[PDB]
């Protein structure tokens, strides 16, 4: 969410906080608290989670 940059058209490109690199067209998942977006491998995901399952990023999963 602060991990967002813009292109010449005003479009937004999200940056993965896990690897600190941009959306490169590969699958991504969004935190259900802070709405940062991550590449699947950077949070250990190989297949889609159960579609109803809540997902939270490592910062929001802290206790």
């Amino acid at each position: 969410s602060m991990y967002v940059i813009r292109d010449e058209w005003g479009n937004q490109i999200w940056i993965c906080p896990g690897c600190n690199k941009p959306d490169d067209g590969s699958p991504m998942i969004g935190c259900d608290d802070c709405d940062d977006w991550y590449h699947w491998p950077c949070v250990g995901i190989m297949t889609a989670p159960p579609e109803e399952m809540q997902w939270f990023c490592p910062k929001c999963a802290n206790k």
Partner: peptide
């Protein structure tokens, strides 16, 4: 979960 750009 909310996912984008999946196969």
């Amino acid at each position: 979960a909310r996912t984008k750009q999946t196969a």
